[PDB]
Amino acid sequence: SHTDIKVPDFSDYRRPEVLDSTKSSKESSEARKGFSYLVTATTTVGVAY
Amino acid sequence: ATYAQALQSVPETQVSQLDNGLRVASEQSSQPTCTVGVWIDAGSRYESEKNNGAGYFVEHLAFKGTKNRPGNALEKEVESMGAHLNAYSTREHTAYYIKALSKDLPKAVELLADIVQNCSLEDSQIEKERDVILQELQENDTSMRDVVFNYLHATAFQGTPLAQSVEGPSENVRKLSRADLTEYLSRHYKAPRMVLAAAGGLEHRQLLDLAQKHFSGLSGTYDEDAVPTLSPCRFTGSQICHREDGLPLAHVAIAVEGPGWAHPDNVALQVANAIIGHYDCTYGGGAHLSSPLASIAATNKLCQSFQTFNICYADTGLLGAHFVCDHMSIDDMMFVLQGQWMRLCTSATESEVLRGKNLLRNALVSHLDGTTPVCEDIGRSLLTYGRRIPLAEWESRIAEVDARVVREVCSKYFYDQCPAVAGFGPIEQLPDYNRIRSGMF
Amino acid sequence: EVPPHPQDLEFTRLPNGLVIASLENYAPASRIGLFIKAGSRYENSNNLGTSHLLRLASSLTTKGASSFKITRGIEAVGGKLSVTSTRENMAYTVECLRDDVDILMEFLLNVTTAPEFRRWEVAALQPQLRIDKAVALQNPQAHVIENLHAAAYRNALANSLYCPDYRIGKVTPVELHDYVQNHFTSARMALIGLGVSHPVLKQVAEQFLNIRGGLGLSGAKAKYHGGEIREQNGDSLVHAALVAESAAIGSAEANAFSVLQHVLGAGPHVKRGSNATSSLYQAVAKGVHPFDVSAFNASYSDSGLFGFYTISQAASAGDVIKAAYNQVKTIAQGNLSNPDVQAAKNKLKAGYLMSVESSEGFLDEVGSQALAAGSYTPPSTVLQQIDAVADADVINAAKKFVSGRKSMAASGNLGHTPFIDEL
Amino acid sequence: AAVPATSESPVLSVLCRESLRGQAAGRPLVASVSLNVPASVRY
Amino acid sequence: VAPTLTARLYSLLFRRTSTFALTIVVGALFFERAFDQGADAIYEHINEGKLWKHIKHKYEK
Amino acid sequence: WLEGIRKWYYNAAGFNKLGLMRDDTIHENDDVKEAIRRLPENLYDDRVFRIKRALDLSMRQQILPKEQWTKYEEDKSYLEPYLKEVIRERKEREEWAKK
């Protein structure tokens, strides 16, 4: 049965802030994305210089 | 009479409550028929890995005989009065309802009470249903749509109870015992978790009377250490791809996390989803359909069908779309679909939003057509909102939505958010997750 | 809470023969349908499939509205336009919020009284006949029921709801025009409405549906013949239907057959139930352990078909069909208890009332009565006509089936599926 | 309107009595086509 | 009750394409000045007393 | 007589010398292509032959005998009703796109 299909455990790869399955990850989504776009912004400025 | 006067003329839904906690709600009409049923806050989201599938198993036994009406006696009684008995289970709710002549309401309520409290669960019947369920699992495996939606939940809510299917894994079906089921039942089937709803030619007072007579014995306590409460379910931007080139068409379901039942944002989201809409090869509109996705798909033959959806759960949900297409059309379909979400986030126009609002208005009213749809709305609403939301309120909520509200709400849930993706079939062309993620902005 | 109504159904027949009927339920949305005697039975050997294409051409250009406008205009108000057909009638229905009925009505009228059937649009639509048919035929029941009618009748009712393959790409604009002109006439039409005021619907019909054409071109009477069509396709399951000519809808004998249908079993009442009170089901179950069986009843204006439908594993086809048939033979021999007949009547009465519970069922019921009897018989009366059926009438209906010349249709791996003469 | 059909059609299951129950035809068929909704075939 | 560091910059300056680009722009100018002055300072410090700008006063207008 | 200059211009234009009708010389844009696609078989096939005959004459730097030249008085627009409707349909779509 396709219902015997369970996503494997990814706990060894998850960021600490999304390790609790009983907590919404939307509270950290802004911080997690804000960092990547800061990285992207700093790289862009470096290359522009 | 204008549409406004029409909304104000709908009979209010009367709600009462018994001492044991059972809620009794009804909407009276003059129909010589009715639908009455029991909606319960029970479903696979309440199940653990060990008893996942218990609720579905119970659904299989519910009409197989009670202490008072063994075997097919319940069956014969329902049939002889020309009534219909049906049931359904979802990840959060379970329902048992009867369609019958309004004059048969008393027997209808008695039977439901009998079903909900005195189910036999005969060991031999349990063994028979075990095989039926296994066969149903095999049949469901042939439904690519059902498979892809179960996969979407498995990945989007991985590691939580919402990741579980309603039917449960086959090994659970083979091992569930009468103990497991009775246990499941005692913990969840309590009066405070149930709603007796009815719609049709009947009076609330009569229904309440019948409820006091047949449901009073239902437990309304449980205790303190056995009150199944729901923990939030983490959502995970992720992807599950089951490649099977042997299947003729690919099925793909993609979604971002939704707000959950109670949130006001669901109305604007429904308007946005109405704008994008649904489509399939048998639609007569074709190239002239208002939805850009629908007309592009129709003129370029991009898919067999597609549908937007807003699946709601207590505190989370799945907001997105599902499409069925040829192996060479997946990338194009994904491209156009995501482009439509982005266009709504940044440039929804007043005219398309008005169309969306009108589509939603028509859907809401045309859905509540008949005693069964109305009765279901009463039962589910009481469980989810704790009250029946009147049409006049829905209109007010829809009315306040405009292009600005659509852009802002869509941006909130779709813009630069991580989606959950499920694919099944000849999906070699399903876009890489990074490309899909970049499509979100 | 006490309901608004409940008002009564208003009826008006115009001089040209067109019937208008409406019920104001004070609902927020309206549902309007134009029923026409133009089902597939009116096609002849030279224009088969013309009504199928017509059914798919509702959004083609008309004199007052372009194809583009029809689609965008109806969608702008979140409306709906659909065409439904049976072997006898065609129903064009529109759905919308009550304030937008004026808009939907204009499109409805253009579609039904002013279509242009432009040569290039008609050609471009042909492929849709193939797609639409393939979708419908994914259902084995469709294969069997279409073949059943083709086997039973020499003409008219013998025609399929779907265009024959050889005709796809061949239906011409002239055939479409001819079909609309010969059948979309005043004396063959009924405008039904729910959630709209009778006066507005009456003024709409008076000003825009004041067409002529009288009774139009009626067809030849359906001539029952009997016969069998076997479609070998090797499916694990065999679908089969066995019928005999019964009675025309509107006759008292038709009521006997409807009650007989529910004695034998006419569909499930309990989710996953064992159908304890279904006579045909219990008879097969005794002699067989995966199948489905059901009494089949089709009643038309000048004829009717009655019998049963079976679904079983290919090897058990003969056992299921014979067991079902024998069970009907016992009823014909008089082995029928009063409690069984009362239960059947209850199912039938409850069933009828449940079918007119929704706007769709209500509209279909009123619209069909309007075209069949040009009159309205209320629920109260229908139930009485049902109670009036006598046990002997039911037994006699069964006897008519048993001794009547049979028609049969079957599809699947037919190695063990018997022929009529082996029953 | 925006109410998609119960079953969406695509072009180019049963394994038990329970799931077979109800499949046998009982009435004449009806064919429906729509501007906005999937086509259907009854009985 | 409020967001964090990165969560603020994101919602404020990165969530948009028009503002995110503006951040890179203005960020570029300020980055350039500080970077160039700091690097020149480090260079001159490492080479204190050796550069023309360091001994220029002994001969200079 | 504007009509006088007209017949004079028609002949000076000279597409008639190749046996072409005025509509045979229209510059094909998307509206025209759709209109041509909507032509009944006979008009489409006639158009194809007149054009082919003209291109052949053009290749040979020749013209038809004077008695076969298209006549000003007999040249009628076979394309107009189709082209007009194609443009009307497009304009309608454009107005709806504006809302």
Ligand SMILES: CCCCCCO[C@@H]1O[C@H](CO)[C@@H](O)[C@H](O)[C@H]1O
């Ligand atoms: C600019 C290209 C957009 C698509 C052009 C199609 O345009 C449509 O063609 C139909 C006939 O096939 C007409 O009935 C309809 O009114 C017209 O809007």
Ligand SMILES: CCCCCCO[C@@H]1O[C@H](CO)[C@@H](O)[C@H](O)[C@H]1O
């Ligand atoms: C391109 C130069 C435009 C001059 C107008 C020509 O005018 C034309 O000239 C012909 C020759 O005499 C006349 O036979 C004819 O009637 C006259 O309309």
